[PDB]
Design a protein around this ligand. Structure first.
Ligand SMILES: Cc1ncc(C[n+]2c([C@@H](O)CCC(=O)O)sc(CCOP(=O)(O)OP(=O)(O)O)c2C)c(N)n1
Ligand SMILES: Cc1ncc(C[n+]2c([C@@H](O)CCC(=O)O)sc(CCOP(=O)(O)OP(=O)(O)O)c2C)c(N)n1
Ligand SMILES: [Mn+2]
Ligand SMILES: [Mn+2]
Lengths: 556, 556
């Protein structure tokens, strides 16, 4: 009888189904059409609920929660452009593997393509970007509940990685007190309601087999390249490479401890590339390599075989080497392909790497973003985590700093968007409950400005450093044309962030030197709140310092 | 020879072609991959160039420019999530007809699906929402320029309404001096380069035929419903209905002068709906009707025929009446189907409409948002335009005010998103150069908060009223459940906007009464700048006032 009640019973099956697949966090934006999902979510004691008014930020909040928790995270939005705003986070999840379950409320079929308010064509609107797409039918008791839960169970069970789009049409009436409509329909699932398992368990695992000729290849002159991986994996890779006696090129995202630091500099030295030409195999673990010199060396090197080990699917070598693409958990893969103690074969590169780091240390004093990057390991929160933004900061830390082995680093380096860094950082913090250092540029902070609202609720101190070099100064590093560079590339906005912090009642510091910066950090880590630290620097100093250090090390 | 040079020659053909189809405005966001497009655009003197750092706002800026200018507007963004951020404005354009030309830079095919930075699958990523989608091939001189310009001319030439997605892959190198690579390839177009017309002229017109039985139907008892249309159209429709003697129900978006105002109130009176039961034909011009009582009357009425005249395509009647869907320019359609002077047939409704307005007038004094809506006609800038936001404000103005005939009203009421209202208003202002009054709610202002950067550049005064009722109070009008209402619907953010204005160096007022509001208005219209006026009101007063006035008029 009651459409509004059955709507909520239908939605209740969807949300309860998700709890059987480890969904704990659910992120909700406001709306009317989403009522059945949102009320079902509110009533379900399994969930931790997060809310936000910007669906683009909401998507990135979910991304950050999923990134850290390694759990699928659900999102509820209403029909219309609210759904479209999830696209950026969905795309990034597609690339880096976060499991985002997007429950998107829709108008019923009778209200599509007839000029109805807030009604658009939603099925398939994210194209190939979701791993799974489910277009649910118009709710009816004539479709059994066992079908509905089975469909959700299939999507979640077979999900190796990435996003799921679950489009959810509901007809009005949406409101009214609940009667018993749909109760007997729900009760057809029997004691599944009191169970802790899915209705349908479908969970095939995707994994490459052991390479049986590894014991042959590990005897050769190899190189280990470490890309993005977990903090624990980084430590394991570091020990493994050391035992092999193979040089380890470690990305800022690797948490390997970077035993040959400043690779973006010493890879620019012909003596290094000459030595690396002796490598017969490269084993890369993880992906999304950061540095330009590393990506250039990757593109140029011609080992007999190039292997990439990672737990995400598809090709990961943009230079298309002859070799192997091995899908595996990195820690597991290392146990299957163990190192045996062997004499190191590289002689020149350790020397060069030490000289490179010394060159950077020689320039540590100036109060600039290159120096902040270089020294960032002095400001990492104890037992905390680092969220690095995109553009120059990730490149400068990668080139100029040596981050501690096993110290957790998080980022959005799939598509490397500057559109969701603050809201992602909020999710990263909330998921782990750890003190968090996040560092972003000024255009990045502006892009996701309203995410400062989310940063008013963190469970441990979060320091947000905004490096303000007045524009996108990556375009001063790149060889952009001088005539058009300022108006069409850099796009300086000539703002500061003191009033933004004040608007959201966040503590704010604008340190003018290292002493004030250290005092600001000392102040910030004291309370479970977000502190904004704006570091104002001269526009092109960071880019020019990198260029100068590159030139200096290349002549070593 | 030079890939960087040819990239720019290929892009130059694309941008020059657009100038032959009335594209004057181009909106550009920063990136490296977009370099060929962006430099080609920068070099082309036909364009007015706009920039912004948030691509979602950039899309809405373009939407606003197109909305007012009635010409196609181009957009350039780089590859990755930048592209995804254009979705909301593209969807809105699909519904209300703005011609947005989206030039989205892409990686070349060899860098897709191989773990390359900022490379995603872009062709088809907007699904069915663009009117036309072009996936350009990897640039090569082996494809003649005449094909490239012809393909663009086909897309723009046959564009009745809505967006065009032009995906533009470019391979590196992107930078480098221009040599003569591609010059002879371009010159194959001969003196087209000096012409003012397209290479291929393909411009069929889409239009319904004259209704040959109109002289029969115009003598029947009809009702005219006026939805969204141009300001000039509003005036013509008002005169046309008056001549026919048919009652005119005029939307806030119609600019008809609303001769039977407060329709959202008096349509709730059974005596009005009883009189309307005599209507044998309803002729609706324009669409996207605003008010609940009007949408409910539309759904319940059963005239012999229901006609909708509008210049956008497809079904526009969400109640699916037996009738006609007539595609035409509204002014042209009225000339093709002229009115005959006939005696008005409605007697009861004019009485009710007068009584309804008196009821609202009785409550004009309180300093609340309902009163602001009612009185807004008294505060319109001379020779200006109104941009009305979504949620309560558009509904309160529609229900409670009588806007002057022919006074331009602009809005985003296709999908009615609250995600781009400030940036749209910025585009609306820049397109017309007129003094602009924009009114939005607090969550709306937060959603598009960084668009205040754009409002730093207006060519005439813009007053931005932010109605702060601490949350989405439309969900206090809707029968949402009380227990979950605050956390999961209203989502109060408990902020003010004084610091937001200050951040972007915009004048700010927080008036405490009408005198102070009028003083703020007086100061604001004096300079070509944006003034922020924050009206802080009691959260649920506006909703409750509307509810009470509805009840009051229903009992007349
Ligand atoms: C949503 C979107 N849209 C546009 C872009 C293009 N884009 C970039 C990519 O080229 C960098 C990808 C990467 O890190 O590899 S970096 C950049 C400027 C950032 O300025 P900033 O925050 O002040 O920092 P700074 O440059 O260090 O001064 C832009 C605008 C994007 N990435 N995402
Ligand atoms: C991008 C997106 N995402 C979510 C929504 C859902 N949604 C609405 C639709 O229900 C209203 C469509 C309409 O106007 O017809 S209104 C609304 C809250 C607005 O709060 P406010 O600005 O403070 O104004 P107030 O309510 O008067 O206090 C939301 C969140 C949306 N529209 N667009
Ligand atoms: Mn910057
Ligand atoms: Mn509000």
């Amino acid at each position: 009888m009651s459409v509004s009640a059955f709507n909520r019973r239908w939605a209740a099956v969807i949300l309860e189904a998700l709890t059987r697949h480890g969904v704990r966090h659910i992120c909700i934006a406001p709306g009317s059409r989403s009522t059945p999902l949102t009320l079902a979510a509110a009533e379900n004691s399994a969930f931790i609920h997060h809310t936000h008014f910007d669906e683009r930020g909401l998507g990135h909040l979910a991304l950050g929660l999923a990134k850290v928790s390694k759990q699928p995270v659900a999102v509820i939005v209403t029909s219309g452009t609210a759904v479209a705003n999830l696209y950026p986070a969905l795309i990034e999840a597609g690339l880096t593997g976060e499991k985002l379950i997007l429950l998107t409320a829709d108008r019923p079929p009778e209200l599509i393509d007839c000029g109805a308010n807030q009604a658009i064509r939603q099925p398939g609107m994210f194209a190939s970007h979701p791993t799974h797409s489910i277009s649910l039918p118009r709710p009816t008791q004539d479709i059994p509940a066992r079908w509905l839960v089975s469909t959700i169970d299939h999507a979640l069970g077979t999900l190796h990685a990435g996003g799921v789009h679950i489009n959810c049409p509901f007809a009005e009436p949406l409101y009214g007190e609940m009667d018993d409509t749909g109760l007997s329909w729900q009760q057809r699932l029997g004691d599944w309601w009191q169970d802790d398992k899915p209705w349908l368990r479908e969970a095939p695992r995707l994994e490459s087999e052991k390479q049986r000729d590894w014991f042959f290849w590990r005897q050769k002159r190899g190189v280990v390249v470490a890309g993005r991986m977990s903090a624990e994996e980084g430590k394991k890779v570091a020990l493994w490479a050391q035992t092999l006696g193979w040089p380890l090129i470690g990305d800022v995202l690797s948490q390997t401890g970077q035993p040959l630091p400043c690779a973006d500099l010493w890879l620019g030295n012909a003596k290094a590339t000459s030595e690396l030409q002796q490598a017969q195999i490269v084993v890369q673990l993880g992906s999304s390599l950061t540095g330009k010199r590393l990506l250039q060396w990757q593109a140029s090197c011609e080992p007999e075989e190039y292997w990439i080990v990672d737990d995400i699917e598809g090709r990961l070598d943009p230079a298309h080497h002859r070799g192997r693409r091995l899908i595996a958990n990195i820690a597991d893969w290392l146990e299957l392909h163990p190192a045996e103690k062997r004499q190191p074969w590289c002689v020149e590169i350790p020397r060069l790497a030490e000289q490179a780091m010394q060159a950077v240390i020689a320039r540590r004093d100036a109060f600039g973003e290159a120096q902040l990057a270089h020294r960032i390991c002095d400001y990492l929160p104890e037992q905390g985590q680092l969220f690095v933004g995109n553009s120059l900061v990730v490149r400068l830390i990668d080139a100029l700093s040596q981050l501690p082995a096993g110290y957790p680093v998080y980022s959005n380096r799939g598509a490397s968007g500057i559109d969701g860094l603050l809201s992602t950082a909020a999710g990263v913090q909330r998921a782990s409950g750890k003190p968090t250092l996040a560092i972003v540029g000024d255009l990045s902070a502006l892009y996701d400005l309203n995410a400062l609202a989310l940063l008013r609720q963190v469970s441990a101190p979060l320091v947000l450093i905004v490096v303000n070099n007045n524009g996108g100064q990556i375009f001063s590093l790149l060889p952009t044309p001088q005539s058009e560079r300022e108006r069409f590339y850099l796009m300086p906005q000539n703002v500061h962030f003191e009033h933004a912090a004040a608007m959201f009642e966040l503590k704010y510091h604008r340190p003018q030197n290292w002493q004030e910066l250290e005092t600001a950090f000392a102040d910030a880590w004291r309370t479970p709140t977000t502190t904004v630290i704006e570091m104002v620097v001269n526009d092109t100093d960071g880019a020019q310092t990198l260029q100068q250090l590159l030139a200096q090390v290349s002549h070593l």
